[PDB]
Amino acid sequence: SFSQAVSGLNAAATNLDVIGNNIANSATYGFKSGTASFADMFAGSKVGLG
Amino acid sequence: SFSQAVSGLNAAATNLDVIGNNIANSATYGFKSGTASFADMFAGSKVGLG
Amino acid sequence: PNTVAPVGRLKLVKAEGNEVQRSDDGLFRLTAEAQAERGAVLAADPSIRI
Amino acid sequence: MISSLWIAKTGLDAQQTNMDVIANNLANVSTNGFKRQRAVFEDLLYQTIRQPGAQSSEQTTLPSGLQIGTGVRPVATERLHSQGNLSQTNNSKDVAIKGQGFFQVMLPDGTSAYTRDGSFQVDQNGQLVTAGGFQVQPAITIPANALSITIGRDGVVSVTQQGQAAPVQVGQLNLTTFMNDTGLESIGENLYIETQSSGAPNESTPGLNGAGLLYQGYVETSNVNVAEELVNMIQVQRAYEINSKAVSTTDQMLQKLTQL
Amino acid sequence: MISSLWIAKTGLDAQQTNMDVIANNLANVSTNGFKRQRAVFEDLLYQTIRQPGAQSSEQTTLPSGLQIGTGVRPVATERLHSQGNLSQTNNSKDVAIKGQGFFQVMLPDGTSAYTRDGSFQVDQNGQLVTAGGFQVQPAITIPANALSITIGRDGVVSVTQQGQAAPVQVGQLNLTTFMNDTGLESIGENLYIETQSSGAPNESTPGLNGAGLLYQGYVETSNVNVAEELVNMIQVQRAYEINSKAVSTTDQMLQKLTQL
Amino acid sequence: MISSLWIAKTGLDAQQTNMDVIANNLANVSTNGFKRQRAVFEDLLYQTIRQPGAQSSEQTTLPSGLQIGTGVRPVATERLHSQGNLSQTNNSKDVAIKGQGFFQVMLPDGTSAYTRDGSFQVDQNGQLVTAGGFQVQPAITIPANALSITIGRDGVVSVTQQGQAAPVQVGQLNLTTFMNDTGLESIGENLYIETQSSGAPNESTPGLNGAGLLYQGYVETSNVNVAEELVNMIQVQRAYEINSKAVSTTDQMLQKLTQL
Amino acid sequence: MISSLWIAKTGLDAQQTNMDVIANNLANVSTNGFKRQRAVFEDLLYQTIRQPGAQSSEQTTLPSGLQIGTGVRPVATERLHSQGNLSQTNNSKDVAIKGQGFFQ
Amino acid sequence: VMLPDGTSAYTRDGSFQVDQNGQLVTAGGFQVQPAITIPANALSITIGRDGVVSVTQQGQAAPVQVGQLNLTTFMNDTGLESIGENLYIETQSSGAPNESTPGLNGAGLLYQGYVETSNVNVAEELVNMIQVQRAYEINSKAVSTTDQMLQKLTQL
Amino acid sequence: MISSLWIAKTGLDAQQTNMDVIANNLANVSTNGFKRQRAVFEDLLYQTIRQP
Amino acid sequence: VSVTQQGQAAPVQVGQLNLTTFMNDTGLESIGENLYIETQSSGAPNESTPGL
Amino acid sequence: GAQSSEQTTLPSGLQIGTGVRPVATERLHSQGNLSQTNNSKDVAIKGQGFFQ
Amino acid sequence: VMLPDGTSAYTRDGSFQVDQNGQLVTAGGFQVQPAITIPANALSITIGRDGV
Secondary structure, eight states: OOSHHHHHHHHHHHHHHHHHHHHHTSSOTTOOOOOOOOOOOOSSSSOOOO | OHHHHHHHHHHHHHHHHHHHHHHHTSSOTTOOOOOOOOOOOOSSSSSOOO | OTTOOOOOOOOOOOOOGGGEEEOTTSOEEEOHHHHHHHOSSOOOOTTOOO | OOHHHHHHHHHHHHHHHHHHHHHHHHHTSSOTTOOOEEEEEEEOOEEOSSOTTOBSSSSOBOSSOOOEEOOEEEEEEEEOOOOOOEEEOOOTTBEEESSSOEEEEEOTTSOEEEEOOOBEEEOTTSBEEETTSOBBSSOOBOOSSOSEEEEOTTOEEEEEOTTOSSOEEEEEOOEEEOSOSTTOEEEETTEEEOOGGGOOOEEEOTTSSSOOOEEETEEEOOOOOHHHHHHHHHHHHHHHHHHHHHHHHHHHHHHHHHHO | OOHHHHHHHHHHHHHHHHHHHHHHHHHTTTOTTOOOEEEEEEEOOEEOSSOTTSOSBTTBOOSSOOOEEOOEEEEEEEEOOOOOOEEEOOOTTBEEESSSOBEEEEOTTSOEEEEOOOBEEEOSSSBEEETTSOEEESOOBOOTTOSEEEEOTTSEEEEEOTTOSSOEEEEEOOEEEOSSSTTSEEEETTEEEOOGGGOOOEEEOTTSSSOOOEEETEEEOOOOOHHHHHHHHHHHHHHHHHHHHHHHHHHHHHHHHHHO | OOHHHHHHHHHHHHHHHHHHHHHHHHHTSSOTTOOOEEEEEEEOOEEOSSOTTOBSSSSOBOOSOOOEEOOEEEEEEEEOOOOOOEEEOOOTTBEEESSSOBEEEEOTTSOEEEEOOOBEEEOTTOOEEETTOOEESSOOOOOTTOSEEEEOTTSEEEEEOTTOSSOEEEEEOOEEEOSOSTTSEEEETTEEEOOSSSOOOEEEOTTSTTOOOEEETEEEOOOOOHHHHHHHHHHHHHHHHHHHHHHHHHHHHHHHHHHO | OOHHHHHHHHHHHHHHHHHHHHHHHHHTSSSTTOOOEEEEEEEOOEEOSSOTTOBOSSSOBOOSOOOEEOOEEEEEEEEOOOOOOOOOOOOSSOOOOSSSOOOO | OBOTTSOBOBOOOOOEEEETTEEEEETTSOBOSSOOOOOTTEEEEEEOTTSEEEEEESSOSSOEEEEEOOEEEOSSGGGSEEOSSSOEEOOTTSOOOEEEOTTSTTOOOOOTTOOOOOOOOHHHHHHHHHHHHHHHHHHHHHHHHHHHHHHHHHHO | OOHHHHHHHHHHHHHHHHHHHHHHHHHTSSOTTOOOOOOOOOOOOOOOSSOO | OEEOOTTOSSOEEOOOOOEEEOSSGGGOEEOSSSOEEOOGGGOOOEEEOTTO | OOOSSSSOOOOSOOOOOOOOOOOOOOOOOOOOOOOOOOOSSOOOOSSSOOOO | OBOTTSOBOOOOOOOEEEEBTEEEEETTSOBOSSOOOOOTTOSOOOOOTTOO
8 A cells, every 4th residue: 555555646747747748848839749548557356556 | 864864955955045145136237146056975885975 | 622632541341349359458459269260460341431 | 682683673774774865865856967876675694494395204395494584685776877857057068968978077186987967167277177176078178269169969069259150169078888877986076987897988979879969058957756755755764663663572572581 | 390491482482483584574675576474383292191092991981181282383484475566666677577487597606596576787798687796597688889678578678779760689588487486495685596395497488378477667575564564573572471471480380399 | 609600790791891882882973073883702711621522432533522611701892984974064174084084183292193073273373273272284374364265175275365366375184094994092082093003104195095085164973873872772781681680590599509 | 880871971961062052052043243153072081901903912913902982072162253144224333244353 | 714823713703804914804813814915095895705805996997806715614513612712723523624615615605794693592591591590409409308318317 | 950941041032022022113103203123132151161 | 314415406315314112111221321222121122214 | 018028029918998988068169041030139140259 | 930939939810910110920929930020101001812
């Protein structure tokens, strides 16, 4: 729960960095916006890893 | 590990001193702003000094 | 202590009460009948432990 | 004096090392061209007692014998060599690297150190120097009558004199790259020297076989991330407190025994 | 000199061993690729005295006769080989295992050891080694001018050179699986060696018949559950208390016999 | 009058010596340039009784005979001559060493002592003295109306005068290095004198021959690490308690002998 | 009454002196032209026992003998004579120093 | 370790010091075998896994090998004679001292920065003191009983 | 009881005097012909453990 | 009795520690140095592999 | 110091001592820290004098 | 050790002192041969492993 929560914290930070990069490039000719895709990291099926 | 953090606190205080001095001279003819540069104090690697 | 080496072996003999007689100086010696059968000098018994 | 005490006395020291690394990283959050550290740990001795796999009978083996272990030791603190974010502080004397190369600087004793800090100054004689006063190599002199300094993406330093429409080339800045960037020995003042684990210094030009690119007016900031250091402090503090609790439990156990 | 004192001494030694195991587990919390250990005890000999089941009388037998037991002894310490939670260190050289495989390294002696920790570095010559400098086999040679190292899910190590849109394969990282994973002999330094109780090393590709998947940029932290360790510390302390009290009670009884 | 009493008395004395060293380390937390101490212990004599290796039979030997040992005694006290953490005192008169050098000062008796403490003052005559008033060597004298004192990394001391655009040199702060730094005899006042076990005094400038670099405005704090001292206090207390229990057991044995 | 107790007693006294210095520095924040104090300590005497460098055998010397030390003592309290921040009170009689002089 | 008289002793206490002429010696001043001389220009001394001692001097980017730490292995360890100050001498029960590199021929490894502590288990010794004390109190009572029996016998 | 405690209590009282002066200055903003106060502090006694 | 040799993932068998069993163990002759010798009331020393 | 022999002297002879006694109770006449009681009548001394 | 009559005796009591003319003597005052004379400006006397 301190490694499953850290993973979610880092994922949210990555998403926010992507959003900030999209905002900063509002006026940039030829720029394409970016989005982040997340996937779970299950192991056994009863033990989630974040 | 107390001196290492005390040094960082002092560096942040110096940065804020420079920022405050720059702000106070917003309207002062012939004023050139200041900028503080920092360098680490590694002793023999594998340990930090601040 | 590596120098420790054997030097000599103590002579240990086996004799019962009926074979030995206390001489006038307190030292036991073989009686006549016992001496005639066991010889003049008693051979060392290898089974004697000290 | 007892085994668990030594093991928990190694746990305390390892967690103190982790806190030292975290605090040193947080203290240098603003120094340009900084690479943050990461401490790695490994298991100490493992007392054999009953040997694992020992042949108990003539046909039955003993699985996973009594392997009582000792505490922990740290192998080393390794530098996480990643590209710090570039900052546009708009000065002609600040240069930032985009790849994985290093600037070469000549130490006063005649040896050469390697630095990724790009805040360069000009001494009284006109040479490019590091902010600590160490002269850069292979020496780039700047005339007194200089109007503008232009350092291109290939490291070419040009100076435009007065009333002349063409720039004058005053040198060529080269980047040193190593087989192993982690093995370099940090000597402070944002300086690293070569060690035998870092291979040999391969000098290269900025854009060819693997030296990075130089951007003028840019400074390379540190790669330290504050939030991760905060979370790591919260976890190191808890681990240190729990190991101290183990020390206290051992102390209490030794008390009752002696009292007996 | 008295039986109860030997029994209580054995109990004290067993509880001290349990505390030593707990302290070792808590000291290796920050170690990557660490597995927590648990000790299992067995009761000692049983004095026969009156053989149970003997004829108590011509037509009757003795039900559950008089057996006097000795103390306790530890059988073995078993590891818990379970997947620890993954941590993102954002490093191109850190590798974590999702399944049940091990990395193979060569000791300087020429023998082969096995480690689950994936914190890898590169030496001065280019080969992938562990933190202790041991060379990962099968030898993976990273060339001089590498820009990025990609390690896939199936163990292929690729290097992307400059100006080439295709990546150059420079090795193949395999995983070794053993029938009995807990039977390995831990030599410390995060290293396990094969014993006769750990079967034979079966090499396999990471993704095939049961080797795990390799994740780049991830490290497998220890599986030590700390709250369980605190509760077990409480339990061990109380058990040591009770055993010491048994020793003290036996001491008080022998005193009255001395006084007689 | 009984062997065990003398042995346990020696043990008590050794533990008291360990506590004395611990207290000395703890009392000097705030001392600049202080080095922590460690005690080394050795076995005392060994009563031989049976000779191990003697001839028990004509073809057998006596393995590991009856050696009875005496108590324990401290061998020696060793310092940990390592770099302490630096502290910024923002004072132009305070100098810190980054390597392994010593400052040479002159005692009033004319003999030279060596100190690593950098808290310097200027006397009424202008000579750079230490906090106790001992004159540094050489007499780095200072002019009358100095505005600022600049001590470089290589020991060059300069003074900036008024109306003069160039700093004047008033001395050269040098460092003394020894073959064995642990062999220097401590005399208090943060002063070490030469002995025959500390080699010879090698005078050198800061930066060459290994001697360290000088930082102006910083002081070298003590290297005492508190957590080790706390765990060692726990160790000392419990070992002292065990040895006192052994003394008490010997006392009860002797008393039982007296009653009969 | 025992050596370690005296050493710890000296350490306590030194730390108390440091606390007094800090308290004095804090009490004079609002004072004009005040220079803060800083205390410097030195390590006390050493009980010699075995002399470091004493010739044990005919040829081998004893390195780093048993130098059991006593506590600590404060040498001095030094002022930091540095230019404090100047404050404008706009008064015709208040004077401030820019360098390193003193009024008599 | 080489003793002043020239005979070699053996120790497991790994706390070493450099003497005034370089030279690694034990804390008692006895020189360790074989010879390692550390120069003045040394910045840091590293002792490897296999006992190789490397010294880093200023300027050189490559460490300079100085000496080799050779471990002496006995086949019967307990047969050694404890000569006092953390030293054992070989006897007829521990003959043939085999010099070897650490890690080879069954020899152990070297960890630098760590010292092996005593293996004395504390609870065992306390329980053993309890047993010894009560045992000395039951033998003393046997002495007293024999004394009383003798006094009663010789009184008549 | 302790020198540090007395020094800190004295510093507290001095800062309280400064606060009272500031409050009295603020309370008399609208008064005509008022002159605001300013407090001047000084160092107290200095014990000579070792004479400079 | 098996020993571990360096580099050999397998133990080397050295020997078997056999136990001698007597019929009337109480009839043995205690000769002193923690040794018993066979007496006519404790005859027939049967060597055996322990456990069998 | 007595002549133990015809040519030698006795060093440090047999002195058996009795217990311990208190000599004197001395006062430390130093300047205590000042406390301000806001009283027009309380006076404090700064040097080394006494009121009569 | 040198007896008053001039013949040499032997002792194992290692408690030695020094008399007023330098010189090491026993607790009884008899002088020890060989003759070892400690000077007056001595700061510390070290007796080594080999009797130096």
